[PDB]
Amino acid sequence: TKPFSLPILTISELTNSRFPAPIDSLFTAQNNNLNVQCQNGRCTLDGELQGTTQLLPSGICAFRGRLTADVDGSHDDRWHMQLTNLNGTPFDPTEDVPAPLGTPDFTGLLFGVASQRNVGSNPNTTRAHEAVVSTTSSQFVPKLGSVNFGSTSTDFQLQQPTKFTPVGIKIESGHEFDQWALPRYSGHLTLNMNLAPPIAPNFPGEQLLFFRSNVPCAGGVSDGVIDCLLPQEWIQHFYQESAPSQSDVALIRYVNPDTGRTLFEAKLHRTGYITVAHSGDYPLVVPSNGYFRFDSWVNQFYSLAPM
Amino acid sequence: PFSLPILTISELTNSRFPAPIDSLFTAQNNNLNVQCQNGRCTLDGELQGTTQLLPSGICAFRGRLTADVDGSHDDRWHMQLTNLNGTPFDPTEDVPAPLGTPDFTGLLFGVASQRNVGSNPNTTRAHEAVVSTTSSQFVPKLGSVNFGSTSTDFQLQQPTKFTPVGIKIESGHEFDQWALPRYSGHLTLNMNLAPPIAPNFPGEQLLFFRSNVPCAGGVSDGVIDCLLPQEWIQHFYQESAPSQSDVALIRYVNPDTGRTLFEAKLHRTGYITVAHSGDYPLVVPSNGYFRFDSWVNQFYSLAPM
Label each residue of chain B as H, E or C. Answer: CCCCCCCCHHHCECCCCCCECCEEEECCCCCCCECCCCCCECCCCCECCCCCCCHHHCCCEEEEEEEECCCCCCCCEEEEEECCCCCECCCCCCCCCCCCCCCCECEEEEEEEEECCCCCCCCEEEEEEEEECCCCCCEHHHCEEEEECCCCCCCCCCEEEEEEEEEECECCECCECCCCCCCCCCCCCCCCCCCCECCCCCCEEEEEEEEECCECCCCCCCEEEECCCHHHHHHHHHHCCCCCCCEEEEEEECCCCCCEEEEEEEECCCEEEEECCCCEECCCCCCCEEEEEEEECCCCCCCCC
- Surface-to-core class of residue A191, CB atoms within 10 Å of its CB (0-12 exposed, 13-18 middle, 19+ buried): exposed
Cβ distance of A233 and B231 shorter than 8 Å? no
Whether A101 maps to a domain, the answer reads yes
- Surface-to-core class of residue B196, CB atoms within 10 Å of its CB (0-12 exposed, 13-18 middle, 19+ buried): exposed
Q: Report the Cα A87 to chain-centroid distance in Å.
A: 18
HSE toward the beta carbon, residue A90, CA cutoff 13 A: 3
| Angstrom distance (rounded) from CA B90 to CA B98 | 8
| Angstrom distance (rounded) from CA B210 to CA B224 | 6
The shortest C-alpha distance from A145 to chain B (Å) reads 20
Taken in order B166, B171, B172, B178, the sign of the CA dihedral is positive
Q: Quote the DSSP letter at residue A303.
A: P
Of the candidates A8, A20, A126, the beta carbon closest to that of B238 is on: A8
| Contact indicator for B149, B129 with CB cutoff of 8 Å | yes
Of the candidates B11, B54, B234, the beta carbon closest to that of A22 is on: B54
The shortest C-alpha distance from A202 to chain B (Å) reads 33
In the beta sheet, which residues pair with residue B24?
B209
Residues B163 and B65 in one domain: yes
Phi, psi angles (nearest 5°) of residue A202: -130, 35
Of the candidates B6, B127, B220, the beta carbon closest to that of A240 is on: B6
| Angstrom distance (rounded) from CA B131 to CA B173 | 12
CA separation, residue B5 to residues A107, B2, B232, B292 (Å): 35, 10, 7, 10
| Contact indicator for A242, A46 with CB cutoff of 8 Å | yes
Helix and strand counts by DSSP (H, E) for chain A: 1, 14
| Angstrom distance (rounded) from CA A36 to CA A220 | 25
Q: Report the Cα A131 to chain-centroid distance in Å.
A: 20
Residues B126 and B209 in one domain: no
| Contact indicator for A242, A269 with CB cutoff of 8 Å | no
Q: What angle do CA B240, B246, B247 make, to 5 degrees?
A: 90
Of the candidates A125, A214, A218, the beta carbon closest to that of B219 is on: A125
Residues A159 and A92 in one domain: yes
Task: Report the candidate in A64, A55, A46, A70 with the shortest Cα–Cα distance to residue A20.
Answer: A55
| Angstrom distance (rounded) from CA B60 to CA A225 | 20
Of the candidates B53, B126, B168, the beta carbon closest to that of A13 is on: B53
Whether A119 maps to a domain, the answer reads yes
| Angstrom distance (rounded) from CA A115 to CA A160 | 10
Which residues in chain B have their CB less than 8 angstroms from residue A219's CB?
Answer: 124-126
The separation between the first and the last C-alpha atoms of chain B, rounded to the nearest angstrom, is: 27
Whether A151 maps to a domain, the answer reads yes
Q: Which residue of B has its CA nearest to A56?
A: B11
Task: Report the candidate in A277, A275, A268, A274 with the shortest Cα–Cα distance to residue A304.
Answer: A277
Q: Quote the DSSP letter at residue A259.
A: T
Pairing of strands A109-117, B107-115: unpaired
Which CATH number fits the domain that encloses residue A226? 2.40.510.10
Whether B88 maps to a domain, the answer reads yes
- Cβ–Cβ contacts within 10 Å for residue B118, how many? 7
Q: Quote the DSSP letter at residue A42.
A: -
The shortest C-alpha distance from A85 to chain B (Å) reads 11
Pairing of strands A249-255, A291-298: antiparallel
Which CATH number fits the domain that encloses residue A75? 2.40.30.120
**Cα Rg of chain A, angstroms:** 20
Residues A165 and A207 in one domain: no
Kindly give, in sequence order, each residue whose CB lies less than 8 Å from that of residue B298, ignoring residues fewer than 6 positions away: B200, B201, B245, B246, B247
The shortest C-alpha distance from B97 to chain A (Å) reads 19
Residues A83 and A125 in one domain: yes
Residues A89 and A147 in one domain: yes
Phi, psi angles (nearest 5°) of residue B56: -70, -10
Task: Report the candidate in A221, A179, A233 with the shortest Cα–Cα distance to residue A56.
Answer: A233
Picking from A10, A19, A56, A125 by the largest number of B CB atoms within 10 A of its own CB, the best residue to mutate is A56
Q: Could you tell me if residue B240 is left (phi over 0), alpha (psi between -120 and 50 degrees) or otherwise beta?
A: left
Picking from B84, B111, B117, B174 by the largest number of A CB atoms within 10 A of its own CB, the best residue to mutate is B111
| Contact indicator for B206, B199 with CB cutoff of 8 Å | yes
- Cβ–Cβ contacts within 10 Å for residue B29, how many? 14
Residues A78 and A42 in one domain: no
| Contact indicator for A307, A276 with CB cutoff of 8 Å | yes
| Angstrom distance (rounded) from CA B100 to CA B103 | 9
| Angstrom distance (rounded) from CA B211 to CA B14 | 7
- Cβ–Cβ contacts within 10 Å for residue B25, how many? 17
**Amino acid sitting at position A169:** I
- Surface-to-core class of residue B187, CB atoms within 10 Å of its CB (0-12 exposed, 13-18 middle, 19+ buried): exposed
Phi, psi angles (nearest 5°) of residue B159: -55, 130
Domain hosting A268: range is 11-53+196-298
Domain count, chain B: 2
Pairing of strands B247-253, B223-226: unpaired
Which residues in chain A have their CB less than 8 angstroms from residue B13's CB?
Answer: 56-58
Which of A135, A170, A205 is the last residue before a domain boundary? A170
Phi, psi angles (nearest 5°) of residue B27: -110, 140
| Contact indicator for A195, A37 with CB cutoff of 8 Å | yes
Residues A48 and A66 in one domain: no
Task: Report the candidate in A292, A294, A293 with the shortest Cα–Cα distance to residue A23.
Answer: A292
CA separation, residue A207 to residues A28, A203, A279, B223 (Å): 6, 9, 7, 47
Whether B237 maps to a domain, the answer reads yes
Task: Report the candidate in A59, A50, A69 with the shortest Cα–Cα distance to residue A19.
Answer: A59
Cα dihedral: A236, A237, A243, A245 (round 10):
-80
Residues B161 and B200 in one domain: no
Residues A207 and A282 in one domain: yes
**Amino acid sitting at position A250:** A
Of the candidates A9, A58, A216, the beta carbon closest to that of B126 is on: A216
| Contact indicator for B176, B105 with CB cutoff of 8 Å | yes
Q: Could you tell me if residue A271 is left (phi over 0), alpha (psi between -120 and 50 degrees) or otherwise beta?
A: alpha
- Surface-to-core class of residue A223, CB atoms within 10 Å of its CB (0-12 exposed, 13-18 middle, 19+ buried): middle
Q: Which residue of B has its CA nearest to A225?
A: B122
Cβ distance of A59 and B20 shorter than 8 Å? yes
| Angstrom distance (rounded) from CA B248 to CA A10 | 29
Whether A243 maps to a domain, the answer reads yes
Which residues in chain A have their CB less than 8 angstroms from residue B288's CB?
Answer: none
Q: Which residue of B has its CA nearest to A113?
A: B165
Which residues in chain B have their CB less than 8 angstroms from residue A225's CB?
Answer: none
Beta strands in chain A (DSSP E): 25-28, 63-70, 79-84, 109-117, 126-134, 146-149, 161-170, 206-214, 225-228, 249-255, 262-269, 273-277, 282-283, 291-298
The shortest C-alpha distance from B122 to chain A (Å) reads 5
The shortest C-alpha distance from A191 to chain B (Å) reads 30
> Collapsing DSSP states into helix, strand and coil, what is residue A142?
helix
| Angstrom distance (rounded) from CA A290 to CA A267 | 17
The shortest C-alpha distance from A244 to chain B (Å) reads 18
A vs B: CB pairs below 8 A: 146
Picking from B3, B21, B53 by the largest number of A CB atoms within 10 A of its own CB, the best residue to mutate is B53
| Angstrom distance (rounded) from CA B220 to CA B175 | 9
Residues B66 and B123 in one domain: yes
| Angstrom distance (rounded) from CA A67 to CA A63 | 12
Cβ distance of A236 and B231 shorter than 8 Å? yes
| Angstrom distance (rounded) from CA A244 to CA A3 | 8
Residues A231 and A250 in one domain: yes
Phi, psi angles (nearest 5°) of residue B142: -85, -5
Whether B41 maps to a domain, the answer reads yes
| Contact indicator for B25, B207 with CB cutoff of 8 Å | yes
Whether A303 maps to a domain, the answer reads no
| Angstrom distance (rounded) from CA B63 to CA A81 | 35
| Angstrom distance (rounded) from CA A267 to CA A274 | 5
